[PDB]
Amino acid sequence: SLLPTAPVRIDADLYDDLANPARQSLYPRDSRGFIRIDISLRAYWHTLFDTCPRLLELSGPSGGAIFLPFMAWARENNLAFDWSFFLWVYVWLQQSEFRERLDEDQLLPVMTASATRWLMIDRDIDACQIVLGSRSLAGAAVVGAKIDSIHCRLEQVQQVAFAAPLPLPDGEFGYFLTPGFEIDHFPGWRPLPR
């Protein structure tokens, strides 16, 4: 009735393989470790595609043609799967078989998704907004602001236009953080973490 933990015993045995779709097969299919890894893989899958459904138009409904090579490429470049997760999927897409089908309609969802993830999970008390820039988004940025009022009806992520031209980032993307909820300085773009 229970599923055998099979060649392992505890979660710590599986840590290294929780984000690796290629090594999942190495566990017996009827084993608990195979299931545990599968719940983890699906968390990554749904975090990517539930938030940015238009990416499935690129890959098809299974998402396999993005998800499998991107997860392999993420391990290769030792990506952190931090708030910039979605931005790094877009970077991968730019060198992928899908590179010709990227437009503003794919770009803005992944920028919103990363600004949203930053403002939901970052715990730096001293940073209240993230500002995201892109070479494919001239003169604007995507700003994610932590909640500072229980009674806001504005979305926590907005697109904001700058009156003074903004330098294009060196990479596809750049970011900076602000203390408090204004943009009263441009310190220059930082490159994506990791």
Add this chain to the structure above:
Amino acid sequence: MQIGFNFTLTGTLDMVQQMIKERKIDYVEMLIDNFVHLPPEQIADSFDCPVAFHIMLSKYLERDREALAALGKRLRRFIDVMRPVYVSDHILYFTHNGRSLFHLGEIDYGEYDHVRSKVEQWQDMLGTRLYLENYPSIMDGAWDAPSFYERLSRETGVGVLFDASNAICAQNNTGAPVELWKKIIETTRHFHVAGYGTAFIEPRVKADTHDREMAEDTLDFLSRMRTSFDKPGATITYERDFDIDYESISVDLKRLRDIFPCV
């Protein structure tokens, strides 16, 4: 038994205030580190009842000390303004070799010395007694966990926030009976319960999703041992993080009141 509900999203404010008016819950449990940039008085004035604190992303087992201390200081101020009935956090594994897990890991309970020293540091920063929640185990750490939490509580003075449905997940997944937790259940005042789902590819493996009505074996658990759960000052937070639907929540809230009547 007081019955609580967890507040995580600001868009659920009007619903939670409705549950307070209709006397469906008696306190609100804040996922408080979601709100560390709000004015603390605005939260206190939003809920016409006591509150309690649940900390999700302190990551106190791994976070660097400077960022951890700043978060602690901010939370200490929230504790002064709102006087939460209790303050609680987790024993979770968030990051493997610099890579964030999106489905959080069960710590290895062999690592007691590491967890002990981190717990003491974080409890010290918060300035109050900390309660630590059990994990909805999938792998066989479920068998180690009760003895681990009792030792940890003895040596550091933390309390245990006992999540009944996480333990039922652990039992369904690993065989570890929920009776292993009897001593902790008769000790702590503070409890959690929620619905759980299943792994998409294996219905026998239970996932702690908080998106669903409480299962029958979770309800038998609470009912079978209602005198062990219920105490002076006992509280139980119902958790609903997804499909946050007013009417389904009210079914589960009423079923808890059926099990734990007011007098």
